[PDB]
Every structure is written in structure tokens, then in C-alpha cells.
Amino acid sequence: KETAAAKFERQHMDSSTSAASSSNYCNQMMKSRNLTKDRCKPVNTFVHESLADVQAVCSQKNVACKNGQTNCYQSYSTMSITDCRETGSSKYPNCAYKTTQANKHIIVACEGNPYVPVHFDASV
Ligand SMILES: [Rh+]
Ligand SMILES: [Rh+]
């Protein structure tokens, strides 16, 4: 299958741009990363940093995950992100999203050998 690490990359990594400047970024990205295929994924975050910089977060500040697991890690430095949030008017299969650009600390859950990001928990 798609590995948990690969799925994290597909759902959450967009190293190609510095920041979603485009009001329409989320409509395009949610579609092309297959997050609209079965339903409208209601919220999703994309990270505009190198893969190495996001993998390195698995070595940074250990914090509790939202689900109570202990394997979450907060970035020491702020990172360029985009939050995608489904609009009130969005109706599957025309998934519609508000695109919000921010510089925030990310929190990711890490798993495996090697120890890599598998889940995007939060930004702060
Ligand atoms: Rh997850
Ligand atoms: Rh999941």
C-alpha cells in the first residue's frame, strides 16, 4: 500500500511554494491530493517547508497528542502553513474551501523505524 509516511506527504507536504497567496489554493490542492475523492475532507493543513525540516520535528519538543497518545512533537521554529477549511456552501462532490496562510509551530505525530511524521495534529 501507500505507507503512513507517504500518506502524510500526500495529505500535508507542499514544499513547492513559500505560502498559498491564492484564494483558490485549497480548492485545487484538496482535489489533486485526493482529499475530496470519497467525501469533502472538512479541515486540512499543508506545510511549506522541506521534507527534511518537517521530518526533523520528530526529534523536537515532545507534547501530548489531542487523542492522549504521547508521540506528538512541536516544531521549535515557526513554519509556513496553509489551513484549508470547508465552506458552509460546499456540497460534495464540488468541495469548496477557505484558504488561510499562517506562520505557526506545527505539531505532528511520529511513528516507525525510521521515526517519521504520520499525522498532523495541530498548529499553535
Ligand atoms: Rh491522523
Ligand atoms: Rh488518520
Side-chain angles (χ1 to χ4, degrees):
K1 308 283 137 67
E2 187 178 44
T3 65
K7 182 186 192 182
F8 174 92
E9 290 188 38
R10 166 174 68 79
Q11 293 202 97
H12 297 298
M13 290 300 301
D14 187 15
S15 296
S16 271
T17 193
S18 79
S21 76
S22 171
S23 46
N24 205 43
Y25 173 87
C26 287
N27 298 325
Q28 295 161 348
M29 288 297 298
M30 296 300 279
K31 185 168 204 168
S32 44
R33 298 304 187 78
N34 260 304
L35 312 185
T36 67
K37 166 206 156 76
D38 285 355
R39 87 201 198 290
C40 302
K41 193 185 173 179
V43 299
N44 190 75
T45 301
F46 294 96
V47 185
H48 314 303
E49 301 294 350
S50 76
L51 184 54
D53 280 6
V54 174
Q55 284 170 165
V57 179
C58 295
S59 77
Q60 300 184 16
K61 183 195 175 156
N62 189 206
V63 300
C65 305
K66 278 170 176 177
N67 67 8
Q69 293 296 282
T70 59
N71 58 312
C72 284
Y73 299 88
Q74 180 175 311
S75 68
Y76 293 122
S77 50
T78 70
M79 289 189 178
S80 180
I81 70 175
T82 311
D83 294 328
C84 305
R85 178 152 134 196
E86 183 188 27
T87 55
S89 43
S90 182
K91 295 293 170 189
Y92 178 85
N94 300 117
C95 302
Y97 291 95
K98 171 161 37 60
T99 293
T100 313
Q101 176 55 212
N103 294 266
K104 299 179 77 176
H105 297 287
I106 65 168
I107 299 170
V108 294
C110 306
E111 288 190 339
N113 174 26
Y115 201 62
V116 293
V118 296
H119 162 83
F120 189 95
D121 206 50
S123 75
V124 293

Coordinates of all heavy atoms in Angstrom, one line a residue, residues 35-102:
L35 N -8.1 14.4 -1.5 CA -8.8 14.6 -0.2 C -10.2 14.9 -0.4 O -10.9 15.2 0.6 CB -8.0 15.7 0.6 CG -6.5 15.5 0.6 CD1 -5.9 16.6 1.5 CD2 -6.2 14.1 1.1
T36 N -10.7 14.9 -1.6 CA -12.2 15.2 -2.0 C -12.8 14.0 -2.7 O -14.0 14.1 -3.0 CB -12.3 16.5 -2.8 OG1 -11.7 16.4 -4.1 CG2 -11.7 17.7 -2.1
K37 N -12.1 12.9 -2.8 CA -12.4 11.7 -3.6 C -13.7 11.0 -3.1 O -14.6 10.8 -3.9 CB -11.2 10.8 -3.8 CG -11.4 9.4 -4.4 CD -10.4 8.4 -3.9 CE -10.9 7.0 -3.9 NZ -10.9 6.4 -5.3
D38 N -13.7 10.6 -1.8 CA -14.8 9.9 -1.2 C -15.8 10.8 -0.5 O -17.0 10.5 -0.5 CB -14.2 8.9 -0.1 CG -13.6 7.6 -0.8 OD1 -13.6 7.5 -2.0 OD2 -13.0 6.8 0.0
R39 N -15.3 11.9 0.1 CA -16.1 13.0 0.7 C -15.3 14.3 0.6 O -14.2 14.3 0.0 CB -16.6 12.6 2.1 CG -15.7 13.0 3.2 CD -16.0 12.2 4.4 NE -15.4 12.7 5.7 CZ -14.2 12.7 6.0 NH1 -13.2 12.3 5.2 NH2 -13.8 13.2 7.2
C40 N -15.9 15.4 1.1 CA -15.1 16.6 1.3 C -14.4 16.5 2.7 O -15.0 16.6 3.7 CB -15.9 17.9 1.3 SG -16.8 18.1 -0.3
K41 N -13.1 16.2 2.7 CA -12.3 16.3 4.0 C -12.6 17.7 4.6 O -12.3 18.6 3.9 CB -10.8 16.0 3.8 CG -10.1 15.7 5.1 CD -8.6 15.5 5.0 CE -8.0 15.4 6.4 NZ -6.5 15.2 6.4
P42 N -13.1 17.8 5.8 CA -13.5 19.1 6.3 C -12.5 20.1 6.6 O -12.7 21.3 6.5 CB -14.3 18.8 7.6 CG -14.5 17.3 7.6 CD -13.5 16.7 6.7
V43 N -11.3 19.7 7.2 CA -10.2 20.6 7.5 C -8.8 19.9 7.2 O -8.7 18.6 7.3 CB -10.2 21.0 9.0 CG1 -11.4 21.8 9.4 CG2 -10.0 19.8 9.9
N44 N -7.9 20.6 6.6 CA -6.6 20.0 6.3 C -5.5 21.1 6.3 O -5.9 22.2 5.9 CB -6.6 19.2 5.0 CG -5.4 18.4 4.8 OD1 -5.2 17.4 5.4 ND2 -4.6 18.8 3.8
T45 N -4.3 20.8 6.7 CA -3.2 21.7 6.7 C -2.1 21.2 5.8 O -1.7 20.0 5.8 CB -2.7 21.9 8.1 OG1 -3.7 22.5 8.9 CG2 -1.5 22.9 8.2
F46 N -1.5 22.1 5.0 CA -0.3 21.9 4.2 C 0.9 22.7 4.7 O 0.6 23.9 5.2 CB -0.6 22.3 2.7 CG -1.6 21.4 2.0 CD1 -2.9 21.8 1.9 CD2 -1.2 20.2 1.5 CE1 -3.9 21.0 1.3 CE2 -2.2 19.3 0.9 CZ -3.5 19.7 0.8
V47 N 2.0 22.1 4.7 CA 3.3 22.7 5.3 C 4.2 23.0 4.1 O 4.6 22.1 3.3 CB 4.0 21.8 6.3 CG1 5.2 22.4 6.9 CG2 3.0 21.4 7.4
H48 N 4.6 24.3 4.0 CA 5.6 24.8 3.0 C 7.0 25.0 3.6 O 7.5 26.1 3.9 CB 5.1 26.2 2.6 CG 3.6 26.2 2.3 ND1 3.1 25.4 1.3 CD2 2.6 26.9 2.8 CE1 1.8 25.6 1.2 NE2 1.5 26.5 2.1
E49 N 7.6 23.8 3.9 CA 9.0 23.7 4.4 C 9.5 22.4 3.7 O 8.7 21.6 3.3 CB 9.0 23.6 5.9 CG 8.4 24.8 6.6 CD 9.1 26.1 6.5 OE1 10.2 26.2 5.9 OE2 8.5 27.2 6.9
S50 N 10.8 22.2 3.7 CA 11.5 21.0 3.1 C 11.0 19.8 3.9 O 10.6 19.9 5.1 CB 13.0 21.1 3.1 OG 13.5 20.9 4.4
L51 N 11.0 18.6 3.3 CA 10.7 17.3 3.9 C 11.6 17.1 5.1 O 11.2 16.6 6.1 CB 10.9 16.2 2.9 CG 10.5 14.8 3.5 CD1 9.1 14.8 4.0 CD2 10.6 13.7 2.4
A52 N 12.9 17.4 4.9 CA 13.9 17.2 6.0 C 13.5 18.0 7.2 O 13.7 17.5 8.3 CB 15.4 17.5 5.5
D53 N 13.1 19.3 7.0 CA 12.8 20.2 8.1 C 11.5 19.6 8.9 O 11.5 19.7 10.1 CB 12.5 21.6 7.6 CG 13.8 22.4 7.4 OD1 14.9 21.8 7.5 OD2 13.7 23.6 7.1
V54 N 10.6 19.1 8.2 CA 9.3 18.5 8.8 C 9.7 17.2 9.4 O 9.3 17.0 10.6 CB 8.2 18.5 7.8 CG1 7.0 17.8 8.4 CG2 7.8 19.9 7.3
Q55 N 10.5 16.3 8.8 CA 10.9 15.0 9.4 C 11.7 15.3 10.8 O 11.6 14.5 11.7 CB 11.8 14.2 8.5 CG 10.9 13.6 7.4 CD 11.7 12.9 6.3 OE1 11.2 12.1 5.5 NE2 13.0 13.4 6.1
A56 N 12.5 16.4 10.8 CA 13.3 16.8 11.9 C 12.5 17.1 13.2 O 13.0 17.0 14.3 CB 14.2 18.0 11.6
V57 N 11.2 17.4 13.0 CA 10.3 17.8 14.1 C 10.1 16.5 15.0 O 9.8 16.7 16.2 CB 8.9 18.4 13.6 CG1 8.0 18.7 14.7 CG2 9.2 19.7 12.8
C58 N 10.3 15.3 14.4 CA 10.1 14.1 15.3 C 11.2 14.0 16.4 O 11.0 13.1 17.2 CB 10.2 12.8 14.4 SG 8.8 12.7 13.2
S59 N 12.2 14.9 16.3 CA 13.4 15.0 17.3 C 13.2 16.2 18.2 O 14.1 16.4 19.1 CB 14.7 15.0 16.5 OG 15.0 16.3 15.9
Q60 N 12.1 17.0 18.0 CA 12.0 18.3 18.7 C 11.0 18.2 19.9 O 11.3 17.3 20.7 CB 11.6 19.4 17.6 CG 12.6 19.5 16.5 CD 12.4 20.5 15.5 OE1 11.6 21.4 15.6 NE2 13.2 20.4 14.4
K61 N 10.2 19.2 20.2 CA 9.6 19.3 21.5 C 8.4 18.3 21.7 O 7.4 18.4 21.0 CB 9.0 20.7 21.8 CG 8.5 20.8 23.2 CD 7.6 22.0 23.4 CE 7.0 22.0 24.8 NZ 6.7 23.4 25.2
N62 N 8.6 17.3 22.6 CA 7.6 16.2 22.8 C 6.4 16.8 23.5 O 6.7 17.5 24.6 CB 8.2 15.0 23.6 CG 7.4 13.8 23.7 OD1 7.5 13.0 24.6 ND2 6.5 13.5 22.7
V63 N 5.2 16.6 23.0 CA 4.0 17.2 23.6 C 2.9 16.1 23.5 O 3.0 15.2 22.6 CB 3.5 18.5 22.9 CG1 4.6 19.6 23.1 CG2 3.1 18.3 21.5
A64 N 1.9 16.2 24.3 CA 0.8 15.3 24.3 C 0.0 15.5 22.9 O -0.2 16.6 22.5 CB -0.1 15.5 25.5
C65 N -0.4 14.4 22.3 CA -1.3 14.4 21.1 C -2.8 14.7 21.7 O -3.1 14.4 22.8 CB -1.4 13.1 20.4 SG 0.2 12.5 19.8
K66 N -3.6 15.3 20.8 CA -5.0 15.6 21.1 C -5.7 14.3 21.5 O -6.6 14.4 22.4 CB -5.7 16.2 19.8 CG -5.4 17.7 19.7 CD -5.8 18.3 18.4 CE -5.6 19.8 18.4 NZ -6.0 20.3 17.0
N67 N -5.4 13.2 21.0 CA -6.0 11.9 21.3 C -5.5 11.3 22.6 O -5.9 10.2 23.0 CB -5.9 10.9 20.2 CG -4.5 10.4 19.9 OD1 -3.6 10.7 20.7 ND2 -4.3 9.6 18.9
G68 N -4.5 11.9 23.3 CA -3.9 11.5 24.6 C -2.7 10.6 24.4 O -2.1 10.2 25.4
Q69 N -2.3 10.2 23.2 CA -1.1 9.5 22.9 C 0.1 10.5 23.2 O -0.2 11.7 23.3 CB -1.1 8.9 21.5 CG -2.1 7.8 21.3 CD -1.8 6.6 22.2 OE1 -0.9 5.8 21.8 NE2 -2.5 6.5 23.3
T70 N 1.3 9.9 23.4 CA 2.5 10.7 23.8 C 3.4 11.0 22.7 O 4.5 11.6 22.9 CB 3.3 10.0 25.0 OG1 3.7 8.7 24.5 CG2 2.4 9.8 26.2
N71 N 3.1 10.6 21.4 CA 4.1 10.6 20.3 C 3.9 11.8 19.4 O 4.0 11.6 18.2 CB 4.0 9.3 19.5 CG 2.7 9.1 18.9 OD1 1.6 9.1 19.5 ND2 2.7 8.7 17.6
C72 N 3.6 13.0 20.0 CA 3.5 14.2 19.2 C 4.6 15.1 19.5 O 5.3 15.0 20.6 CB 2.1 14.9 19.4 SG 0.8 14.1 18.5
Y73 N 5.0 16.0 18.5 CA 6.2 16.8 18.6 C 5.9 18.1 18.0 O 5.3 18.2 16.9 CB 7.3 16.1 17.8 CG 7.7 14.8 18.4 CD1 7.0 13.6 18.0 CD2 8.6 14.7 19.5 CE1 7.2 12.4 18.6 CE2 8.9 13.4 20.0 CZ 8.2 12.3 19.7 OH 8.3 11.1 20.2
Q74 N 6.3 19.2 18.7 CA 6.0 20.6 18.3 C 7.3 21.1 17.7 O 8.4 21.0 18.3 CB 5.5 21.4 19.5 CG 5.2 22.8 19.1 CD 4.6 23.5 20.3 OE1 3.6 23.0 20.9 NE2 5.1 24.6 20.7
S75 N 7.3 21.8 16.5 CA 8.5 22.5 15.9 C 9.0 23.6 16.8 O 8.2 24.4 17.4 CB 8.1 22.9 14.5 OG 7.2 24.0 14.5
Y76 N 10.3 23.7 16.9 CA 10.9 24.8 17.7 C 10.8 26.1 16.9 O 10.6 27.2 17.5 CB 12.4 24.5 18.0 CG 12.6 23.4 19.0 CD1 13.3 22.3 18.7 CD2 12.0 23.5 20.3 CE1 13.5 21.3 19.6 CE2 12.2 22.4 21.2 CZ 13.0 21.4 20.8 OH 13.2 20.4 21.8
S77 N 10.8 26.1 15.6 CA 10.7 27.3 14.8 C 9.3 27.3 14.2 O 8.7 26.2 14.0 CB 11.8 27.4 13.8 OG 12.0 26.2 13.0
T78 N 8.8 28.5 13.9 CA 7.5 28.7 13.2 C 7.7 28.2 11.8 O 8.9 28.2 11.3 CB 7.0 30.2 13.3 OG1 7.9 30.9 12.4 CG2 6.9 30.8 14.7
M79 N 6.7 27.7 11.2 CA 6.8 27.1 9.8 C 5.7 27.8 9.0 O 4.6 28.2 9.5 CB 6.6 25.6 9.8 CG 7.8 24.9 10.3 SD 7.7 23.2 10.1 CE 9.3 22.7 10.8
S80 N 5.9 27.9 7.7 CA 4.9 28.4 6.7 C 3.9 27.3 6.4 O 4.3 26.2 6.0 CB 5.5 28.9 5.5 OG 4.5 29.4 4.6
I81 N 2.6 27.5 6.7 CA 1.5 26.6 6.6 C 0.3 27.2 5.9 O 0.2 28.5 5.8 CB 1.1 25.9 7.9 CG1 0.3 26.9 8.8 CG2 2.3 25.3 8.6 CD1 -0.2 26.3 10.1
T82 N -0.6 26.4 5.4 CA -1.9 26.8 4.9 C -3.0 25.9 5.5 O -2.8 24.7 5.3 CB -2.0 26.8 3.4 OG1 -0.8 27.6 2.9 CG2 -3.3 27.4 2.9
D83 N -3.9 26.5 6.2 CA -5.1 25.8 6.7 C -6.2 25.8 5.6 O -6.4 27.0 5.0 CB -5.7 26.4 8.0 CG -4.7 26.2 9.2 OD1 -4.0 25.1 9.2 OD2 -4.7 27.0 10.1
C84 N -6.8 24.7 5.2 CA -8.0 24.6 4.3 C -9.2 24.2 5.2 O -9.1 23.1 5.9 CB -7.7 23.5 3.2 SG -6.2 23.9 2.3
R85 N -10.3 24.9 5.1 CA -11.5 24.7 5.9 C -12.7 24.8 4.9 O -12.8 25.8 4.2 CB -11.6 25.8 7.0 CG -12.9 25.7 7.8 CD -12.6 26.3 9.2 NE -13.7 27.2 9.7 CZ -13.6 28.0 10.7 NH1 -12.5 28.1 11.5 NH2 -14.6 28.8 11.1
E86 N -13.5 23.7 4.9 CA -14.6 23.6 4.0 C -15.6 24.7 4.3 O -15.9 25.0 5.5 CB -15.2 22.2 4.2 CG -16.4 21.9 3.2 CD -17.1 20.6 3.5 OE1 -17.1 20.2 4.6 OE2 -17.6 20.1 2.5
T87 N -16.2 25.4 3.3 CA -17.1 26.5 3.4 C -18.5 25.9 3.8 O -18.7 24.7 3.6 CB -17.3 27.2 2.0 OG1 -17.6 26.3 1.0 CG2 -16.0 28.0 1.7
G88 N -19.4 26.7 4.3 CA -20.8 26.3 4.6 C -21.6 25.9 3.4 O -22.6 25.1 3.5
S89 N -21.2 26.4 2.2 CA -21.9 26.2 0.9 C -21.3 25.0 0.1 O -21.9 24.7 -0.9 CB -21.8 27.5 0.1 OG -20.5 28.0 0.2
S90 N -20.2 24.5 0.5 CA -19.5 23.3 -0.1 C -20.5 22.1 -0.1 O -20.9 21.7 1.0 CB -18.2 23.0 0.6 OG -17.6 21.9 0.0
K91 N -20.7 21.5 -1.3 CA -21.5 20.3 -1.4 C -20.7 19.3 -2.3 O -20.5 19.5 -3.5 CB -22.9 20.6 -2.0 CG -23.8 21.5 -1.2 CD -24.3 20.8 0.1 CE -25.0 21.7 1.1 NZ -25.2 21.1 2.4
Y92 N -20.3 18.2 -1.6 CA -19.7 17.0 -2.3 C -20.5 16.8 -3.6 O -21.8 16.8 -3.4 CB -19.6 15.8 -1.4 CG -19.1 14.6 -2.0 CD1 -17.7 14.4 -2.1 CD2 -19.9 13.7 -2.6 CE1 -17.2 13.3 -2.7 CE2 -19.4 12.5 -3.2 CZ -18.0 12.3 -3.3 OH -17.5 11.2 -3.9
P93 N -20.0 16.5 -4.8 CA -18.5 16.5 -5.0 C -17.8 17.8 -5.4 O -16.7 17.7 -5.9 CB -18.5 15.5 -6.2 CG -19.6 15.9 -7.0 CD -20.7 16.3 -6.0
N94 N -18.5 18.9 -5.3 CA -17.9 20.3 -5.5 C -17.4 20.8 -4.1 O -18.1 21.6 -3.5 CB -18.9 21.2 -6.2 CG -19.3 20.8 -7.5 OD1 -20.5 20.5 -7.8 ND2 -18.3 20.6 -8.4
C95 N -16.3 20.2 -3.7 CA -15.8 20.6 -2.3 C -15.2 22.0 -2.4 O -14.4 22.2 -3.3 CB -14.8 19.5 -1.9 SG -15.5 17.9 -1.8
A96 N -15.6 22.9 -1.6 CA -15.2 24.3 -1.5 C -14.5 24.6 -0.2 O -15.0 24.2 0.9 CB -16.3 25.3 -1.8
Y97 N -13.4 25.4 -0.2 CA -12.5 25.6 0.9 C -12.1 27.1 1.1 O -12.0 27.7 0.0 CB -11.3 24.7 0.8 CG -11.6 23.2 1.0 CD1 -11.8 22.4 -0.1 CD2 -11.7 22.7 2.2 CE1 -12.1 21.1 0.0 CE2 -12.0 21.3 2.4 CZ -12.2 20.5 1.3 OH -12.5 19.2 1.4
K98 N -12.0 27.6 2.3 CA -11.3 28.8 2.6 C -9.9 28.6 2.8 O -9.5 27.6 3.6 CB -12.0 29.4 3.8 CG -11.3 30.7 4.4 CD -12.3 31.5 5.3 CE -13.2 30.6 6.1 NZ -12.6 29.7 7.1
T99 N -9.0 29.3 2.1 CA -7.5 29.2 2.1 C -7.0 30.2 3.1 O -7.2 31.4 2.9 CB -6.9 29.3 0.7 OG1 -7.3 28.2 -0.1 CG2 -5.4 29.4 0.7
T100 N -6.4 29.8 4.3 CA -5.7 30.7 5.3 C -4.2 30.4 5.4 O -3.9 29.3 6.0 CB -6.4 30.7 6.6 OG1 -7.9 30.8 6.4 CG2 -6.0 31.8 7.5
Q101 N -3.4 31.4 5.1 CA -1.9 31.3 5.2 C -1.5 31.8 6.6 O -2.1 32.7 7.1 CB -1.3 32.1 4.1 CG 0.3 32.2 4.1 CD 0.9 30.8 4.1 OE1 2.0 30.6 4.7 NE2 0.3 29.9 3.5
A102 N -0.5 31.1 7.2 CA -0.1 31.5 8.6 C 1.4 31.0 8.8 O 1.9 30.2 8.0 CB -1.0 31.0 9.6

